[PDB]
Structure formats: structure tokens, C-alpha cells
Ligand binder design. Structure first.
Ligand code: 4OK
Length: 287
């Protein structure tokens, strides 16, 4: 609908990142405070590589229309490009799950899981590879709806290939990465499935600080290991079928879903459509 910088009133900071930054604003063109509250994503330090990446990210979100995918509202130019999205009042599923640990049961976690699978299958249909599935990137609309909230690392597959090779300079979410993503930089629907199992793990730990994928893996590798060595030993751990433990209270049938996503053989990993059916079958049994 095109947003004018002069009417985007800053309210607060919703989140930070190395390349991104998200603010809570009020788009009030009438200056009568009847304007809608929106989320604004801006580049922390704008370069030409980050800018071109951001324009590719804006087109990715503009092209996505799904109930479990954050709504795109528009852009805000000067040059200093800003992505306008809908405001989701409850924030990340990461922070929400901690605050309502006591209030969110396994049945409800499976509702969220199911929704994540639906949104992820929608992405696959468009040949988009998320490359950063983590509960931190899932946003809460209300108690009964979560949406995939960021697409900063999302890449479109080549027409001819089923993977995409990319080595982005800087810090990667290595503890959510499939082995082939760590060793060969190959990103596919199957590496997204691996990362999904880490999301499902995250949920069932209720984001307990000590139980996080980095903390659990660093414990397995050794807290003495530093720098480029962490990636090396993680590769070796995953190769020797070293895996995240079953979260406390997690039923064996949910942990099985996790371990199946964490297959070293890319081809024997489940599909998002099969993951959805299983999660829904388990939900229906619990109900
Ligand atoms: N689209 C959105 O509405 C939205 C988007 C992001 C986001 C997306 C991508 C990236 Cl890369 C980042 Cl960093 C952030 C974060 C939040 C969104 N709504 C929120 C409501 C509340 C909070 C929150 O926890 N707060 C702020 C209020 O005080 C308590 C602590 C955070 C968010």
C-alpha cells in the first residue's frame, strides 16, 4: 500500500541481529492515533550485498500467502529500505513458550508443530529453502496460532537442482544445521526437515536454558573446544550418530519424529506432509 517514512512512528525495539533489526511502529498518516501498529525490519548496517539480499527476502515474503506465514504489508524507502509486516502481539514462540511453560501442554505444542509443518510445506511448494528454522523465528498471533516470522536466509532452489550451496560469511546457526549443511554447505527441503526436528526438540524442552541445542551439543563436544574446532567436532559427533537427548517428559513417539528428521541420509528424512500427518495422528490420539 506504500508507506511514507514521515508517518511511521517508532514505539519500541522488538529484536536485534547481526544484519537485521525489527521495530514496533505505528503507521499514523492522519496523526489522530487511529493508525495500525506494524513490525518494521531494517538492515542494521546497509551494504550492497545485504541490500540485494534484503530485496530478494522482501520478494520472497511478498510471494507468500498462508495462515502460518507472517503477512507482508509493504516497503518504506528514503535507499534506506524497510520491510513492513503485520504486528504479532505475543512475539517469538521461543520467548512465549518460557512465559507460559505451566499453561502450554504437549497437545498445544503439537498444535504449534502442526502449523509449522503446514507453513514449511507451503514453502516447499514454492521451492523456497528456509535455512533458519528455530523457535526464535516463529511468531505467536494468539494462543491457537503461530506463524513463520522471518525469511532472512531463505533461498530459492535452482530449477534443475534439489539443493542449494551457500556459505554466508559470519555466524551460522550450526546447532540447527544438517550434517551436509555443515560439511558441504548444501541446503535443501531435507536440511529444513533436520532443522524442524531441532524446532520440535526446542518445544519439548520448553526452552530450558541448560537444555538448549548449543548447550547440549557443547556439553557433548566439550566446553574446552573453541573456534573452528566446534564445527569440526560437531561434524564428527553427528557422523558418529551423536544426537540431542530426549527432552524431559517427551513421549517416545514425539522423540521418534525428532530422530527421523535427524537422519544422516538426506533421502531417508520424512517429508513435511508426512510429518504433519504423524503430528496430527498423535494429536487426535491424545484428544
Ligand atoms: N512481526 C512481528 O510482529 C514481530 C517480529 C519480530 C522479529 C522478527 C524477525 C526478527 Cl529477525 C526479529 Cl529479531 C524479530 C519480533 C516480534 C514481533 N512481535 C513481537 C512482540 C513482542 C516481542 C517481544 O518479545 N518483546 C517486545 C515487547 O516487550 C517484551 C519483549 C517481540 C516481537
Amino acid at each position: 500500500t506504500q508507506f511514507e517514512e514521515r508517518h511511521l512512528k517508532f514505539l519500541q525495539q522488538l529484536g536485534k541481529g547481526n544484519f537485521g533489526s525489527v521495530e514496533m511502529c505505528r503507521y499514523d498518516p492522519l496523526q489522530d492515533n487511529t493508525g495500525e501498529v506494524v513490525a518494521v525490519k531494517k538492515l542494521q548496517h546497509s551494504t550492497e550485498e545485504h541490500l540485494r539480499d534484503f530485496e530478494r527476502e522482501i520478494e520472497i515474503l511478498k510471494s507468500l500467502q498462508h495462515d502460518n506465514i507472517v503477512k507482508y504489508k509493504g516497503v518504506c524507502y528514503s535507499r534506506n529500505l524497510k520491510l513492513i509486516m503485520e504486528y504479532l502481539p505475543y512475539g517469538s514462540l521461543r520467548d512465549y513458550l518460557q512465559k507460559h511453560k505451566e499453561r502450554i501442554d504437549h497437545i498445544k505444542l503439537l498444535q504449534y508443530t502442526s502449523q509449522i509443518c503446514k507453513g514449511m510445506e507451503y514453502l516447499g511448494t514454492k521451492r523456497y529453502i528456509h535455512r533458519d528454522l528455530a523457535t526464535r523465528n516463529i511468531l505467536v498471533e494468539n494462543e491457537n496460532r503461530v506463524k513463520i516470522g522471518d525469511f532472512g536466509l531463505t533461498k530459492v532452489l535452482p530449477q534443475d537442482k534439489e539443493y542449494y550451496k551457500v556459505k554466508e560469511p559470519g555466524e551460522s546457526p550450526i546447532f540447527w544445521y544438517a550434517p551436509e549443511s555443515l560439511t558441504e554447505s548444501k541446503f535443501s527441503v531435507a536440511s529444513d526437515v533436520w532443522s524442524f526436528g531441532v524446532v520440535l526438540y526446542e518445544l519439548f524442552t520448553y526452552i530450558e536454558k541448560s537444555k538448549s541445542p548449543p548447550a547440549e551439543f557443547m556439553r557433548m563436544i566439550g566446553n574446552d573446544k573453541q573456534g573452528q574446532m566446534i564445527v569440526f567436532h560437531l561434524i564428527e559427533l553427528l557422523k558418529n550418530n551423536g544426537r540431542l537427548p530426549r527432552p524431559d517428559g517427551c513421549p517416545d513417539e514425539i522423540y521418534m519424529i525428532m530422530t527421523e528428521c535427524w537422519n544422516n541420509n538426506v533421502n531417508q528424512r520424512p517429508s513435511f506432509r508426512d510429518l504433519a500427518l504423524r503430528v496430527d495422528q498423535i494429536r487426535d490420539n491424545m484428544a
